[PDB]
Amino acid sequence: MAVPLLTKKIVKKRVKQFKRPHSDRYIGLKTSWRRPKGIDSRVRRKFKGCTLMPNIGYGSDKKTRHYLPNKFKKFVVHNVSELELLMMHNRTYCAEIAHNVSTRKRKEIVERAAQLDIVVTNKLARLRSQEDE
Template identity: 55%
Template sequence: ANPTPLVKRTIVKKKRTKFKRWQSDRFMRVSESWRHPRGIDGRQRRRFKGTPVHAKIGYGSNKKTRHMLPSGFYKFRGCNEADLELLLMHNRSYAAEVAANVSSSTRKKIV
């Protein structure tokens, strides 16, 4: 009885290290979120041996399975009934999700 997607692709999650910001382990003021190193003499910017890897496009996942849910559908966020009527033609590839800022009374009308 559960809906099935039109094409079920296997989602491959690549194994990779978490890209950390340069010297984020040395200073508390430097957060771990990735920033590209821009120092003129920086070892990581010059990609020396023993330094952490840079974030590159090759680490990305497959374009066809990117943002895909484990069920095989893509998520579509809707705020009202008109938004969800768009999915009538694409109900085999997109799954509806009611937005978080929708009130409970409107949510009951949508469902």
């Protein structure tokens, strides 16, 4: 059930990457997609090769939406209290230590996380913050 859906999402990819037209030659013109409003655009007219437009159909399977490639659902964890919510899920949810949190407070998150058995990315973020490559 869950496992072949994961395979479909990861292997197929619609990592098309929606680049704005003429982003390449005008630096200030942003990489971020905005819809060509004018009729005169080739991109609007839906010429192929001119970078295909974002549409809903490109969208992934409902189950595999907002999932880490491990098949875990990613949650940014601010503090110790929030770990208790993640404990209910275990396998289904992941803990990732927030940017705001400083190094000492990261350590207490890691040791608690170990007890829940949601070791993945939580430990990794902390280890860098210590000193490590």
